[PDB]
């Protein structure tokens with residue numbers, strides 16, 4: 001029912017093609033991937049928001065799974081690699097952050113988490129919109145990147161909360177601003193140790209219950225924190241204050257997406273259009 005145009009990427013969950021529906025003329029992203037997955041995925045069809053890549057259809061046929069998504073022309077990694085010499089301008093960074101926080105406040109209010117936010121999962125159009133892609137696919141179901149993984153996941157917490165998406169988004173914010181990934185780990189311990197080196201080794205004072213976590217070891221080295229002004233210059237004081245609340249160790253103290261939308265950093269938010277080369 002779909003004509004493959006080109007290979008657009010390769011996810012955890014299978015390979016993705018830009019495709020054309022032969023009956024409608026519609027251009028879509030076709031992703032080819034147990035009764036349990038079916039019901040979860042079908043619940044995603046109703047989870048609709050302008051800052052979430054629209055799931056158009058779930059095609060369970062000939063004992064196979066295809067997800068048909070809205071197509072967007074560009075991802076945030078490629079826009080960042082392409083914006084490398086001058087950086088993404090601040091008003092655009094802020095507008096993308098604000099829109100992503102809208103999409104997360106939406107999903108989280110419906111008790112749906114992403115779990116794997118990353119620049120390659122954040123898709124942009126020519127209208128200045130940014131959208132979350134693959135929402136809900138990790139709960140429904142190449143080396144997987146760890147750079148955006150929240151410390152409670154890395155510490156083996158089995159029951160992650162919406163706080164894990166705020167951490168990832170925090171990491172992406174820092175990266176848009178500095179033009180470098182914040183925590184580029186290449187293994188779980190390297191990832192954890194890069195977080196500790198920047199934010200301090202967490203203890204019982206900043207994160208109660210931490211030393212009881214499954215993969216916590218008393219033997220972790222103990223590094224002191226660094227100042228956000230060393231970590232993300234040239235971000236201003238409001239952006240630094242928001243980021244630090246998005247990067248709180250304790251997931252219970254981490255700001256929510258809805259509180260983050262009220263933060264003074266967003267007082268002058270606007271919706272710029274990007275210069276996009278397609």
Ligand SMILES: CC(C)c1cnn2c(NCc3ccccc3)cc(NC[C@@H]3CCNC[C@H]3O)nc12
Nearest residue numbers: 009010011016029069071072073074120121133
């Ligand atoms: C949510 C999906 C299925 C969708 C809709 N548009 N789009 C684009 N568009 C950006 C793009 C366009 C042309 C060439 C490369 C990338 C890229 C893309 N890449 C797939 C990766 C692997 C699976 N999960 C999402 C992403 O990490 N997935 C999607």
